[PDB]
Amino acid sequence: KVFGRCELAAAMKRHGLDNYRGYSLGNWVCAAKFESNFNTQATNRNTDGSTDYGILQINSRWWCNDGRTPGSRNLCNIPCSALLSSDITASVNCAKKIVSDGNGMNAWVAWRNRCKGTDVQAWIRGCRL
Ligand SMILES: [Au+3]
Ligand SMILES: [Au+3]
Ligand SMILES: [Au+3]
Ligand SMILES: [Au+]
Ligand SMILES: [Cl-]
């Protein structure tokens, strides 16, 4: 599924991500825009053999199982394929564990490099929420 911006904002709020760990909804929308361009099916292989999955590009090195990432963990206790669903529940639930791991949203390098410190409210500007 390719979400619209406000559509994604609304789903993320529905699943409790807005102000989760103090991160406003525009931060989450901005991270999803530069991680996946709002496409739930996005997958990208890392140099190290892990893969990133879904709207928030969650990495098989630590968070999900894809059976081909030797030495990796599965801390969200889910198959990585679940993170490709049109329903973002599994990606949100995992993202809540990631953002609680201690480095907040810096766990998403595209959030640090392209969202952190910017006017992230523009990502929800205009949205009926
Ligand atoms: Au594996
Ligand atoms: Au923090
Ligand atoms: Au905001
Ligand atoms: Au949802
Ligand atoms: Cl959804």
From Swiss-Prot:
Substrate binds at D101. It is found in: Secreted. CDD domains: LYZ_C (cd16897). GO terms for molecular function: beta-N-acetylglucosaminidase activity; identical protein binding; lysozyme activity. GO terms for biological process: cell wall macromolecule catabolic process; defense response to bacterium; defense response to Gram-negative bacterium; defense response to Gram-positive bacterium; killing of cells of another organism. Keywords: Allergen, Antimicrobial, Bacteriolytic enzyme, Disulfide bond, Glycosidase, Hydrolase, Secreted, Signal. Monomer. Lysozyme C is capable of both hydrolysis and transglycosylation; it also shows a slight esterase activity. It acts rapidly on both peptide-substituted and unsubstituted peptidoglycan, and slowly on chitin oligosaccharides. SMART domains: LYZ1. This is Lysozyme C. PROSITE patterns: GLYCOSYL_HYDROL_F22_1, GLYCOSYL_HYDROL_F22_2. In the egg white and polymorphonuclear leukocytes. Its EC number is 3.2.1.17. The keyword Signal applies. SUPFAM superfamilies: Lysozyme-like. Lysozymes have primarily a bacteriolytic function; those in tissues and body fluids are associated with the monocyte-macrophage system and enhance the activity of immunoagents. Has bacteriolytic activity against M.luteus. Its main location: secreted. It catalyses: Hydrolysis of (1->4)-beta-linkages between N-acetylmuramic acid and N-acetyl-D-glucosamine residues in a peptidoglycan and between N-acetyl-D-glucosamine residues in chitodextrins. Residues 1-129 form the C-type lysozyme domain. The active site is at E35, D52. Belongs to the glycosyl hydrolase 22 family. It is an enzyme of class 3 (hydrolase). InterPro entries: Glyco_hydro_22, Glyco_hydro_22_CS, Glyco_hydro_22_lys, Lysozyme-like_dom_sf. One of its GO terms (cellular component) is extracellular space.
